[PDB]
Symmetry: D2
Subunit: 84 residues, 4 copies
């Protein structure tokens, strides 16, 4: 089974949009290397992204929201270390 | 555990777009009743949607792709039978 | 100038999602042949699509909402008659 | 006519996704105050956003891509100065 990505986003905060945008950014560049990307509704300003359980991004810790390039780089390092 | 929706789409067919559109259609109308909606890359003209493992749509069987309303109705019937 | 596509959608009806989905479907298959695709907030059950002013789709007339292939075919015929 | 937003994006760069994402971010928070948001295919690393002709963002000048909040703030200042 291929790596699973989970994007937990605050629904009341209207973060579905950016969450689905990032999911598509990932699914289009790692179409072959990803098992599936899940969007998980959450609450309280939550915005976290995990790869096979390992946190790859969290709003507070990383200070905001990821640029597509930065997020792809972090997923690349965990899924396919060597990949330009 | 809230109901999990899985959308398996053909990547080579360029169906990511419509798959992410339907995922957002679902997440915005069932934000509180859905555990998570997953997009799962597949192949060979596949386009299937499951709710807690139960098939709610399949390209061939249902003849094409779902209208948002139709898909929401099928998910409603399984997740919240009584809901206008 | 290149052909301009306008998608007028009912905002209260929550049709922004499907409107943006169709806009992307069009911009990704006709990237070189389209001047620009516009999303225009409308009211009251409105869902109309025009190509250089010529109606290419409306809800009542066409009975619902377009499948991607159908809409692309209609834009094809007006923008590049001969094209698969 | 209401303010028109134009998002010029580099097609070869695969920036349609992020362009459509920002368009939706804008259309959902300014549904009533915007005439229409247009996505305009471009080239050569372009990423520009204008409001009634006035540049509200440009990749090089502003150094990268806008956060939804930042972009909404800039459109707010030009379209409805006083608004939270």
């Amino acid at each position: 089974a291929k790596p699973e990505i989970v994007i937990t986003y605050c629904t009341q905060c209207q973060w579905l949009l950016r969450a689905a945008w990032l999911a598509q950014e990932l699914l289009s560049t790692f179409a072959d290397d990803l098992g599936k990307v899940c969007l998980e509704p959450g609450t309280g300003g939550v915005f976290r992204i995990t790869c096979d359980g390992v946190q790859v991004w969290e709003r507070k810790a990383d200070g905001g929201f990821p640029e597509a390039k930065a997020l792809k780089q972090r997923v690349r390092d965990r899924i396919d270390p060597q990949r330009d």
